[PDB]
Amino acid sequence: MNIMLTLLTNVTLASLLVLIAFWLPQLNAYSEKTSPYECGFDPMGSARLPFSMKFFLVAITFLLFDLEIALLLPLPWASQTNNLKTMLTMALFLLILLAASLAYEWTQKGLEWAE
Amino acid sequence: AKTLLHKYSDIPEGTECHRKAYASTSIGGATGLIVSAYSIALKPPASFLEGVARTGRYTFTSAAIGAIFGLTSCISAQVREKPDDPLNYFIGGCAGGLTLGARTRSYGIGAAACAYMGLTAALVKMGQLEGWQVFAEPKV
Amino acid sequence: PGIVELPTLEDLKVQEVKVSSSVLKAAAHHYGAQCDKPNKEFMLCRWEEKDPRRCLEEGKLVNQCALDFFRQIKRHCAEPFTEYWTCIDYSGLQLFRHCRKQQAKFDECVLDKLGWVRPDLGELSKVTKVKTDRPLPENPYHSRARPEPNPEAEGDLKPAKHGSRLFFWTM
Amino acid sequence: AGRIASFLKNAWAKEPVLVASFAIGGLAIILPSLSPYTNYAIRINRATPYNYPVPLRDDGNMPDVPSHPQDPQGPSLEWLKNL
Amino acid sequence: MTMMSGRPGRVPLQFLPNEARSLPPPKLTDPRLVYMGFLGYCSGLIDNAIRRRPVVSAGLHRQLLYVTSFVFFGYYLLKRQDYMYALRDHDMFAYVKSHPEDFPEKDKKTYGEILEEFHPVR
Amino acid sequence: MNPIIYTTLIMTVMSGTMLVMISSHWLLIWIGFEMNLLAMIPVLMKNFNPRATEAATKYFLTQATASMMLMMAIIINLLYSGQWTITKMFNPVAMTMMTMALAMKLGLSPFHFWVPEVTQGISLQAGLLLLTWQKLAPLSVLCQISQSINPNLMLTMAMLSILIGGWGGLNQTQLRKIMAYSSIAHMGWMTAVLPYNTTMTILNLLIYITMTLAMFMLLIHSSATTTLSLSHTWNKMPVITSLMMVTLLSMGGLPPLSGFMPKWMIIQEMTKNESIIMPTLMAMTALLNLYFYMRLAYSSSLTMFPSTNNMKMKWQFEHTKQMKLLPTMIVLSTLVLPMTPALSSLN
Amino acid sequence: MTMYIAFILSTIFVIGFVGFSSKPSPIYGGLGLIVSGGVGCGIVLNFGGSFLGLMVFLIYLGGMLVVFGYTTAMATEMYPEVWVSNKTVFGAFVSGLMMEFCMVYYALKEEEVEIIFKFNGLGDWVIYDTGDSGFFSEEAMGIAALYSYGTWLVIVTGWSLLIGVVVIMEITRGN
Amino acid sequence: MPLVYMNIIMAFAIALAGLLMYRSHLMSSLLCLEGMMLSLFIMSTLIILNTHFTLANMMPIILLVFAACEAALGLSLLVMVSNTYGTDYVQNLNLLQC
Amino acid sequence: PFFDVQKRLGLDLDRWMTIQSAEQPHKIPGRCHAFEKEWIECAHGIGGIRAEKECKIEFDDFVECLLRQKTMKRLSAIKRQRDKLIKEGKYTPPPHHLGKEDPRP
Ligand SMILES: CCCCCCCCCCCCCCCCCC(=O)OC[C@H](COP(=O)([O-])OCC(O)COP(=O)([O-])OC[C@@H](COC(=O)CCCCCCCCCCCCCCCCC)OC(=O)CCCCCCCCCCCCCCCCC)OC(=O)CCCCCCCCCCCCCCCCC
Ligand SMILES: CCCCCCCCCCCCCCCCCC(=O)OC[C@H](COP(=O)([O-])OCC(O)COP(=O)([O-])OC[C@@H](COC(=O)CCCCCCCCCCCCCCCCC)OC(=O)CCCCCCCCCCCCCCCCC)OC(=O)CCCCCCCCCCCCCCCCC
Ligand SMILES: CCCCCCCCCCCCCCCCC[C@@H](O)O[C@H](CO[C@H](O)CCCCCCCCCCCCCCC)COP(=O)(O)OCC[N+](C)(C)C
Ligand SMILES: CCCCCCCC/C=C\CCCCCCCC(=O)O[C@H](COC(=O)CCCCCCC/C=C/CCCCCCCC)COP(=O)(O)OCCN
């Protein structure tokens, strides 16, 4: 209930700053002024055209390595168990396969960006 | 639902022909709506109103078939004083087949539907009389 | 399905222990040393009966033992104890460690006036034995009768008469 | 013996990060099985009383169960204070 | 839909319980074993024909191994099948015995006292 | 694809199926399906081309939808009983959702659309795998929860599968689509008997897998994927076309061939449960499968189609690779009817 | 009854689902799914699931960042669609909104079996348990048990993650 | 049942419907698949917390793991489709028929 | 279909997680532990067909603990009657139900 009040206060302050920024100063908007910036000149194509991603394979791999973090975050609590040999074996096993998947993609040129 | 089939079959055979005709028309309309849904899904009708027209065509044909069948069979049963007789269902099914043929405007479709629909309806009546099971329970 | 029986509000009355959690925490070790017997009786009752309605008298004995303990403390040295639990109470986590001088004074006080020895590390968490006159409850789950099993397999295995008997096969 | 020597030499010269990583990983894997304190950690975890110790009904045949916490029977945490 | 999977005291993956040994094993000239050997022989011949080798002559060690493998597996298949039929009959008889009120013995009539309907053929 | 990677992926597919088959917990069964699909997508694209990409994409979409539905059914079942064990479903709605999810995984009608397209889009080896090994897991799950399932929905989907398999197979000239429609009809047969006797389901599955393995291996041996390309095999390998002719008749279900045994066993079991009508429909409809098998046998073995001049060069070369189990598969696909009472060992 | 906070949160959850299911531009679909993930974090937090809520929020933030990159890379069109730039997207959005409205009305003013079963409402607080014990979080204990009880689960998930890396490398190879 | 449970099941139904009815982009369907997973996570978590099944607190994490694998798998296929056609449209993949 | 490798080898690959009454960490119990214990012990070894009829009482109690449908119905009935009798002024709520109780420890 305190965190909800905090979030509400912060969003309200930011929104009021935007409101002031838009309603206090004088506004003189014309087409030349509101046009897209490309350093002196008119853009050739649209900025909504497909923009190639050369690290597309590291982006997919990030999705799988980010879930390794969800499996490793309970580790401070897992350390409190009685069968520490099973916990340590399992935790070590998990990080070893994470290192092996990194070694696989590295040696197969999966970390190099497309050319 | 099969609650529609019960609202059809809860009415006795040669009694209240208007109610039985209404029930059979409802069954036919449901069937035609399902048919038109699958038809629109698998072969798009190129515009909204043409899909509406195809739906109306299919549903009206199916409901007309159901109406004619139920009306004819109930009336034939009550006039002949012969309930529990597959001939009434045969007459109704053949009338429904003639309805479908007049709808598609095809003499061959008319005759073929007369025959096959009548035989199917007579078989359904025989199964109701004898206790035949389509989806039998696992008895053993 | 049957009416639930509840004690009347009269049988639920007791002389309450109306001291706060800091006082309880400051006294906890000696309180567990001194009032062990009725507390253990009550917990054994509670965990064998699985019904709070069956252990009210043990709970009232628990209350009276706590009140006698605190009356002894009040009668022999309230001031060292008050110092100690005020120190404990200042802390937002109520940590024993930030109050060792006050705890030492309170401990010397009870050791000299009453002969109370603070339990050592690991003793209050022992599983102990309790001698009781309360009969061991027979069906604390109020179980029904279990259904009878299926009879069993028995006898010698003889080859099936006339083999498999599939349509035309003779074996 | 001399193949792996020059191999680790070239690795330390070209990829010291991977060398240190494999050393630290291998140590983390093998050292816990040679330690006399791993059992101490298991025992420390077992000595932490998270839930209430439910007492046992005395039947006159329990010579090794205490009847009061300060009685001498039961487990001892003395080894822990001196640790 | 699963009649014998849940039977009591059944080991998960035996293929041949110990109780099966109270049953007579199939003879080695059992016609079903001979048919399994014939299946192995046909497999050997088709093997020769596919690899464009002489059909009846090419690999005699190979054909012998085909026949032997088929006979070997078929022996144990027959043992398990006969054992399962013995289980079925055992259970059926025990169930009939323990539920006599479901399988009553009614007095049977001679045909002299049963009135049968006559239908002339004409 | 590196051979070691291909072996690892085949082993992961098989281990996912085995996880589905050995598990007692619904979550582990779901994990088995997930692992199977994960390893199976690359096997479809092993030979890269746009058609293989499209086939793998349609496959992934269908199977992942089925997976979500399966998980939702498990969660509803847990909500109405704190149970994770796979026995009999507690909630009727959860059972409907589960049945539809497994039908989508199997490709039963009306969820049959994916099977012909994906089968046509991949190679003959991947098609072999897709149509034999990919059926074990959902069928085993269905066998476990058989008492719980509603007969009306199951039998509806099974009869639809038989009808649609026959009708769709009638129109094909590509051999992979013929095999796919054959598979759809066979699945209909397997699932029609499931609420009555799971042993008949297992027997049907074993015989179907044997015949399908034989057919796919014969199609690989004579590297043909169309009807006209298979019409040449007589002028290079006549034994292959004769064996294919007999295997085709066994698939049709004609006696005294093995293919007739599953149909015969299923009809008999159904009659015991007072169900005369469903079986009469099923057999009369399998007549369609027999028709297009007979058409393929006409074009491939019983008559001789014209050939090409370059076939003379092929006359001079033996097959580089030989299939070890092809001979055994043909014999088990054709000559096993006298061994029918051995089905008791399956229960 | 009390403040019906979780009811408002679950309604906003459904609204975000309608937002991204209407199938508009992916930039706005990912926005809708982020909003849904955040309010689902809140829903779970209100029941005692702090770790699980925060975890699903973190995971979906990472996933939607990857999806934004892929949308600019392969999902772009000269005029990306919003919920009001298209009759089809707007119609799906409105139909989902008032379908949720009809479900909620029919459920809270009388007691109907929609599809599975029925419900009267009362607010979520009624089904709580009033349990009084512990120096720990039971959620944290059950999740930590993955390393002592759930050895088999750890094995199968680690294998699947390694195989997933190998698989994406195989799929995106080309040739 | 509780109002909250009804809302989560509705979210699953809406996402399932979204997946089923395709538009032009594949990425939108992939998003719908993710949405279904999100609703399954929430539903299972609510059921598990409510009944205090302690050991089942780990299954939503496993659910997320597999969901990530599925998401990764989906994006790979999209990369290959886009490389073939220069567009992630569903209509392009019509080479194979029934 | 189901090859019980666990039972043959005595492994416990996933049986530790199938039910709510089975060995939780720190002995934390399930909310419906006793009801489930009872339903499991009532139906053990008698097979699925007999268990559904002969253990329906235990299972109905278990489901009531799980979903609490009858409890919410009874509470709703009581509160509706309270609302109705209060609107007409026939019934007056006690002080300890309006916020003026004498709280006890
Ligand atoms: C737990 C499991 C439960 C799961 C299920 C739960 C689902 C709940 C969630 C629903 C909430 C909404 C969520 C958002 C979904 C996303 C929608 C989307 O993305 O659309 C993409 C999709 C394609 O996007 P696009 O490519 O960008 O647009 C291209 C143009 O649309 C097309 O280009 P075009 O103009 O060139 O094409 C011509 C035009 C032509 O369109 C047409 O031809 C349709 C015209 C037929 C009118 C129907 C006749 C009216 C009377 C029937 C009433 C029945 C009772 C009457 C009784 C007797 C009457 C006296 O369009 C089409 O051909 C496409 C066909 C689409 C038709 C709608 C699909 C529904 C199934 C097909 C049935 C067809 C109607 C047969 C009747 C069936 C029974 C009603 O958009 C659409 O196709 C329609 C707009 C979507 C808005 C409405 C969707 C809501 C319906 C969902 C299911 C309804 C509830 C299910 C059961 C409820 C009971 C529990
Ligand atoms: C196993 C051993 C051997 C057995 C196997 C061999 C025998 C079996 C099959 C042999 C042939 C039977 C096949 C039936 C005919 C199929 C029709 C057809 O193909 O349509 C496609 C064909 C394609 O046409 P389309 O492309 O759509 O349009 C262009 C048309 O050509 C343009 O046409 P249009 O514009 O020039 O005129 C068409 C129009 C007008 O047609 C005309 O222009 C000329 C008039 C022809 C009608 C004749 C009526 C006057 C004479 C009838 C005499 C009484 C009947 C016998 C009773 C004897 C009493 C002792 O047609 C009508 O609307 C006729 C209205 C109703 C009259 C006929 C219906 C009554 C049915 C009979 C019930 C009998 C119950 C049993 C009695 C119990 C005592 C034994 O349609 C036709 O062209 C044929 C039109 C004539 C059909 C009616 C004649 C049928 C004669 C009796 C049939 C009943 C036998 C089956 C028994 C099973 C019933 C459950
Ligand atoms: C076309 C003919 C079909 C050919 C089939 C393939 C034959 C070769 C396969 C290799 C044979 C070895 C398989 C079994 C060896 C040991 C494993 C054994 O322990 O399995 C037992 C089971 O034994 C096997 O199931 C028997 C396999 C025998 C298959 C052949 C029967 C074919 C039917 C009639 C056609 C005649 C075929 C002729 C042979 C070539 C486990 O019992 P259980 O775990 O409790 O049951 C699991 C299934 N449940 C629970 C659902 C019931
Ligand atoms: C048993 C321990 C396991 C657990 C610890 C490890 C956990 C995490 C560490 C491993 C992460 C994955 C490593 C992936 C290896 C990639 C190898 C590679 O291909 O990179 C080489 C670089 O590395 C190599 O040279 C290949 C392997 C050479 C040896 C690397 C270390 C091997 C082990 C060395 C130490 C042995 C053990 C420690 C003993 C210490 C001495 C007491 C190429 O570099 P590029 O980036 O492509 O350069 C581009 C511009 N030219």
Please tell me which chains touch D, using 3 or more CB pairs under 8 Å as the contact test.
Answer: A, C, G, I
Contacts of G32 (CB under 8 A, 6+ apart): G16, G17, G19, G20
3-class SS shares of chain I: helix, strand, coil, % to 5: 60, 0, 40
Cβ(H79)–Cβ(A56) below 8 Å: yes
The dihedral built from the CA positions of residue C149, C153, C155 and C159, taken in this order, carries a sign that is: positive
Contacts of H76 (CB under 8 A, 6+ apart): A60, G167, G168, G171, G172
Contacts of G98 (CB under 8 A, 6+ apart): none
Q: Point out the residue among E9, E32, E82 whose CB comes nearest to the CB of C153.
A: E9
Print the SS3 string covering C19-32. CCHHHHHHHHHHHH
Residue among C63, C61, C76, C55 at smallest CA distance from C18 = C63
Cβ(B103)–Cβ(B64) below 8 Å: yes
The dihedral built from the CA positions of residue A62, A68, A70 and A74, taken in this order, carries a sign that is: negative
Angle between helix axes B17-42 and B2-9 (nearest 10 degrees) is: 160
Question: What 3-state class would DSSP assign to H89?
Answer: strand
Cα angle for residues F323, F326, F329 (degrees, 5° grid): 155
DSSP letter (8 states) at residue I80 = H
DSSP string across C85-122: HHHHHHSSS--STT-SHHHHHHHHHHHHHT---PPPTT
G171 shares contact with chain F (CB less than 8 Å):
yes
Do the chains contact at E1 and F345, CB–CB below 8 Å?
no
Q: State phi, psi for A37 to the nearest 5 degrees.
A: -90, 120
> Where do the structural domains in chain E lie, given as residue ranges?
1-99
Do the chains contact at A82 and D46, CB–CB below 8 Å?
yes
Ligand 4 near D9 CB (within 6 A) = no
Would you identify the CATH topology of the domain A1-108? Methane Monooxygenase Hydroxylase; Chain G, domain 1 (1.20.58)
Residue E114 gets the label, from left (phi > 0), alpha (psi -120 to 50) or beta, of: beta
Instruction: Work out the number of other CB atoms within 10 angstroms of the CB of residue H61.
Output: 25
Instruction: Work out the number of other CB atoms within 10 angstroms of the CB of residue I39.
Output: 24
Q: Which residue of G has its CA nearest to D48?
A: G135
Cβ(F211)–Cβ(F259) below 8 Å: yes
Written as six digits, the tokens of C35 are 């009032």
Residue H55 lies in a domain: yes
Written as six digits, the tokens of C14 are 């007791």
Whole-number Å distance between alpha carbons of E66 and E40: 5
Written as six digits, the tokens of D3 are 């193949």
Cβ(A62)–Cβ(H78) below 8 Å: no
Whole-number Å distance between alpha carbons of D71 and C40: 15
Quote the ligand 3 centre to I46 CA distance (angstroms). Answer: 28
Cβ(F189)–Cβ(F109) below 8 Å: no
Whole-number Å distance between alpha carbons of G136 and G152: 25
Do the chains contact at E12 and I47, CB–CB below 8 Å?
no
Instruction: Work out the number of other CB atoms within 10 angstroms of the CB of residue F187.
Output: 29
Ligand 1 near H35 CB (within 6 A) = no
Q: In chain F, which residues have their Cβ closer than 8 Å to the Cβ of I18? A: 24-25, 83-85
Do the chains contact at C149 and I46, CB–CB below 8 Å?
yes
Q: State phi, psi for H21 to the nearest 5 degrees.
A: -95, 100
C162 shares contact with chain E (CB less than 8 Å):
no
* Alpha carbon nearest to ligand 1 atom 58, residue: B29
Written as six digits, the tokens of F266 are 């299923």
Question: What 3-state class would DSSP assign to F174?
Answer: strand
DSSP letter (8 states) at residue C155 = S
Cα B41 from chain centroid (whole Å): 24
Give the residues surrounding ligand 3 with Cβ less than 6 Å away: E 5, 12-15, 77; F 203, 206-207, 210, 258, 332, 336, 339-340, 342-343, 345-347; I 1-3
Q: Range of G109's domain?
A: 5-172
Whole-number Å distance between alpha carbons of G108 and H3: 8
Helix (H) or strand (E) holding B5: helix B2-9
Q: Which of F332, F334, F347 to mutate to test the pocket of ligand 3 (most atoms within 8 A of CB)?
A: F332
Q: Which residue has the tokens 């926005």?
A: G31
Cβ(E38)–Cβ(E71) below 8 Å: no
Q: Please give the number of the atom of ligand 1 that sits closest to the Cα of F72.
A: 1
The string over F162-182, giving b where at least 16 C-beta atoms fall within 10 Å of a residue's C-beta and e elsewhere, is bbbbbebbeebeebbbbbbbb
Contacts of E81 (CB under 8 A, 6+ apart): C164, F341, F342, F344, F345
From residue H88, alpha-carbon distances to B101, E53, F235, G67, H49 in Å are: 46, 53, 46, 13, 40
Q: Closest approach of chain H CAs to the CA of F345, in angstroms?
A: 38
In single-letter form, the type of residue at position E79 comes to K
List the alpha helices (DSSP H) in chain F.
3-22, 26-44, 50-80, 92-106, 114-121, 124-132, 136-144, 151-169, 175-192, 198-221, 227-230, 238-251, 260-272, 277-297, 311-314, 326-334
Torsion of CA C10, C14, C19, C22, to 10 degrees: -100
DSSP letter (8 states) at residue B83 = -
Written as six digits, the tokens of F109 are 């009608």
Q: Which residues pair with F174 in a beta bridge?
A: F226
Cα F275 from chain centroid (whole Å): 26
From residue F225, alpha-carbon distances to C72, F124, F312 in Å are: 98, 8, 21
Do the chains contact at F25 and I15, CB–CB below 8 Å?
yes
Print the SS3 string covering A4-72. HHHHHHHHHHHHHHHHHHHHCCCCCCCHHHHCCCCCCCCCCCCCCCCCCCCCHHHHHHHHHHHHHHHHH
Do the chains contact at H50 and G47, CB–CB below 8 Å?
yes
Contacts of F2 (CB under 8 A, 6+ apart): none
Q: Which residue of F has its CA nearest to E49?
A: F239
DSSP string across chain E: --SSTT-TT--TT-SS-GGGGGSPPPPTT-HHHHHHHHHHHHHHHHHHHHTT--TTTS-HHHHHHHHHHHHHHHHHHHHHHHHHHHHHHHHHHHHHHH-GGGS--PPPPPTTTS--------
Please tell me which chains touch B, using 3 or more CB pairs under 8 Å as the contact test.
Answer: F
Give the up-direction half-sphere exposure of residue F103: CA atoms within 13 A in the CB hemisphere: 26
Q: State phi, psi for A24 to the nearest 5 degrees.
A: -80, -50
Whole-number Å distance between alpha carbons of F30 and F23: 10
Cβ(B61)–Cβ(B102) below 8 Å: no
Whole-number Å distance between alpha carbons of D55 and C75: 32
At CB < 8 A and 24+ separation, what contacts does B56-62 make?
B58/B32, B58/B33, B59/B29, B59/B32, B59/B33, B60/B32, B61/B32, B61/B100, B61/B103, B62/B28, B62/B29, B62/B31, B62/B32, B62/B33, B62/B35
Residue among C44, C47, C42 at smallest CA distance from C59 = C42
Cβ(F166)–Cβ(F182) below 8 Å: no
Question: What 3-state class would DSSP assign to G45?
Answer: helix
In single-letter form, the type of residue at position G113 comes to V
In single-letter form, the type of residue at position A102 comes to L
Residue among C101, C92, C123, C127 at smallest CA distance from C28 = C123
I50 shares contact with chain F (CB less than 8 Å):
no
Residue among F211, C170, F261, F343 at smallest CA distance from E77 = F343
Q: Please give the number of the atom of ligand 1 that sits closest to the Cα of G93.
A: 14
The dihedral built from the CA positions of residue C156, C161, C165 and C168, taken in this order, carries a sign that is: positive
Determined by which method?
cryo-EM
In single-letter form, the type of residue at position A84 comes to L
Q: Which residues pair with C150 in a beta bridge?
A: none
Q: In chain F, which residues have their Cβ closer than 8 Å to the Cβ of H25? A: none
Whole-number Å distance between alpha carbons of D59 and E68: 69
Q: In chain F, which residues have their Cβ closer than 8 Å to the Cβ of H72? A: none
Written as six digits, the tokens of B7 are 């609202």
Whole-number Å distance between alpha carbons of B116 and A10: 75
Resolution of the structure, angstroms:
2.6
Whole-number Å distance between alpha carbons of G103 and G96: 11
Upstream peptide bond of I25 is cis (omega within 30 degrees of 0): no
Whole-number Å distance between alpha carbons of G142 and D29: 26
Written as six digits, the tokens of A29 are 């908007």
How many beta-carbon pairs below 8 A join chains B and F?
Answer: 31
Q: State phi, psi for B45 to the nearest 5 degrees.
A: -90, 15
* Alpha carbon nearest to ligand 2 atom 33, residue: B107
Q: In chain I, which residues have their Cβ closer than 8 Å to the Cβ of G138? A: 28
- Please state the length of chain E: 122
Quote the ligand 4 centre to D11 CA distance (angstroms). Answer: 8
Contacts of B63 (CB under 8 A, 6+ apart): B25, B26, B28, B29, B32
Cβ(B89)–Cβ(B54) below 8 Å: no
Ligand 2 near B111 CB (within 6 A) = yes
DSSP string across F31-58: HHHHHHHHHHHHHHTSS-SHHHHHHHHH
Written as six digits, the tokens of E77 are 């298949």
Cβ(D52)–Cβ(C43) below 8 Å: yes
Contacts of B109 (CB under 8 A, 6+ apart): B100, B101
Whole-number Å distance between alpha carbons of H17 and G20: 11
Instruction: Work out the number of other CB atoms within 10 angstroms of the CB of residue B16.
Output: 14
In single-letter form, the type of residue at position A103 comes to A
Q: Which CATH number does the domain housing residue H53 bear?
A: 1.10.287.3510
Domain count of chain H?
1
Give the up-direction half-sphere exposure of residue G88: CA atoms within 13 A in the CB hemisphere: 11
Do the chains contact at D50 and G135, CB–CB below 8 Å?
yes
Q: State phi, psi for F174 to the nearest 5 degrees.
A: -80, 135
Whole-number Å distance between alpha carbons of D32 and A86: 12
DSSP letter (8 states) at residue H69 = H
Q: Closest approach of chain G CAs to the CA of D55, in angstroms?
A: 18
The string over H73-84, giving b where at least 16 C-beta atoms fall within 10 Å of a residue's C-beta and e elsewhere, is bbbbbbbbbbee
Radius of gyration of chain H (CA): 17
In single-letter form, the type of residue at position D78 comes to E
> Please, which residues 13-42 of chain I have a Cβ atom closer than 8 Å to chain E?
none
The string over C110-143, giving b where at least 16 C-beta atoms fall within 10 Å of a residue's C-beta and e elsewhere, is beeeeebeebeebbbbbebbbeeebeeeeeeeee
From residue F188, alpha-carbon distances to B137, F159, F210, F263 in Å are: 18, 6, 17, 12
D36 by Cβ neighbours in 10 Å (0-12 / 13-18 / 19+) ranks as: exposed
DSSP letter (8 states) at residue H22 = -
Q: Which of B104, B107, B109, B120 to mutate to test the pocket of ligand 2 (most atoms within 8 A of CB)?
A: B107
Domain count of chain G?
1
Q: Closest approach of chain H CAs to the CA of A38, in angstroms?
A: 26
Whole-number Å distance between alpha carbons of E93 and E103: 11
Q: Point out the residue among F9, F31, F91 whose CB comes nearest to the CB of G156.
A: F31
Q: Point out the residue among E46, E47, E81 whose CB comes nearest to the CB of F344.
A: E81
Q: Range of H75's domain?
A: 3-85
Cβ(F82)–Cβ(H51) below 8 Å: yes
Cβ(G73)–Cβ(A56) below 8 Å: yes
The string over E22-58, giving b where at least 16 C-beta atoms fall within 10 Å of a residue's C-beta and e elsewhere, is ebeebeeeeebbebbbbbbbbbbbbbbbbeeeeeeeb
Whole-number Å distance between alpha carbons of F15 and G160: 11
The dihedral built from the CA positions of residue G141, A97, F19 and F106, taken in this order, carries a sign that is: positive
Cβ(G92)–Cβ(G22) below 8 Å: yes
Quote the ligand 4 centre to A67 CA distance (angstroms). Answer: 24
From residue F142, alpha-carbon distances to F146, F194, F285, G115 in Å are: 6, 8, 24, 24
How many beta-carbon pairs below 8 A join chains A and H?
Answer: 22
Q: Which residue of H has its CA nearest to G1?
A: H3
Residue B123 gets the label, from left (phi > 0), alpha (psi -120 to 50) or beta, of: alpha
Written as six digits, the tokens of E19 are 């109780």
Find the farthest-apart pair of alpha carbons in chain G and give their distance in angstroms, rounded: 63
DSSP letter (8 states) at residue C131 = -
Contacts of I34 (CB under 8 A, 6+ apart): C50, C141
Instruction: Work out the number of other CB atoms within 10 angstroms of the CB of residue C106.
Output: 26
Q: Please give the number of the atom of ligand 2 that sits closest to the Cα of B105.
A: 27
DSSP letter (8 states) at residue C153 = -
Ligand minimally distant from the alpha carbon of residue E84: 3
Q: Closest approach of chain C CAs to the CA of F217, in angstroms?
A: 33
Question: What 3-state class would DSSP assign to A113?
Answer: coil
